[PDB]
Amino acid sequence: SGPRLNTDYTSANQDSRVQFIVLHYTSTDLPHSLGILTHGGVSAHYLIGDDEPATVYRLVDENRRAWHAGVSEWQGRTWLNATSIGIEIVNQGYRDTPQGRVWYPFSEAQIQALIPLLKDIAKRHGITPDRIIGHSDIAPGRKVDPGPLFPWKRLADAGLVPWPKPGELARRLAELNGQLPDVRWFQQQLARHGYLVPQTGELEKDTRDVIGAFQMKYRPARFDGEPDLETAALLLAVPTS
Template sequence: MPNPLLPGLQLQPLPYHDRLPVRDPSSLAMVVIHCTELPDLATAREYGERVLYDSGAGNSGHFYIDRDGSVVQYVAPERIAHHVRGMNADSVGIELVNSGRYPHWLDSRHQAMDEPYTEAQLLALERLLQALVLQYPSLRQIAGHDQLDLEQVPASDDPAVTVARKRDPGPLFPWQRILAKVPLQPLG
């Protein structure tokens, strides 16, 4: 049976999916764009499967978009995923596979995020966002993870220097292009 949200969407629920709290879909207000800051989708899956909380759940977005444009759903939008501190209850997390600062996330000498997003990823993101807005009309805003988690932390190479804990989706994310294609308002 094809998934009604998006043609080609691959459903691959995380092992703890059914432990995540259910929410009213009409409470969804924001989409948060992330990048995995990992080398590939398989590694992102491994990170997503790690249990980090007493509830038996871990950190994960709802949707992952690989470099080839394939879209995988790890968590249904009707469930609360752990993808951005303090903003999970009413948001949907979309992760784009991108190396970001990997593997030196907090090293002050490696803060560049210079891997461009692929055309296939961006087209898939546009289709997914359009489908989400149709399915969940309460979605009104879009933000990057870096806009919601502003914490500065000591750099791993020099604790006297601070770096952003989260920088994704990064400086190469084409906000103008995405905002022109979807009826979501930027945070602010």
């Protein structure tokens, strides 16, 4: 097109533009999700339906930019849309009780659809486990999906995401000696894991949101964002894979 172009040669120094995979849930049923993701203000490359077997919809090819992430950061990479593949999952989200928050679990059909997909996408694009991540991770104070009911442990089992090895955990809390590290330490470990986090040494929402997000992934029994001893053990036992 236009001036004298030469296409004889091809660089060996070549790569995928896609570095991350961001997991989501839709907060809507399958019919509404299709509309929103095709003609809403938002989009994802894939949409995993509810049925058995769970049907996966390619709505945007992995070559173009889907609008799923918004304002985002992971491992210092900002605005992840352009550098990522978004995967939405039809799931109803959460509800509020007076004693905290409850969530709809994911159908098993959708999980067994999700794993093969992630393996295939990760292989083609050479994406590592530490870059297959949730929306709650890339925007901790703003997002919370796919939530504490996402079976990361299953993805870990398929080798798709980081997870501590047996008794790595138990060894790490043995090292801590019962002494809880200070906020600044937690902030260091979180940034090291890839999270955007304040380095102040203070525990404001911003720092609490981020610790809360990490807890949701690896210790969803509680994720109030309150510095715990177990959380510290995870911050050391969890791989950077």
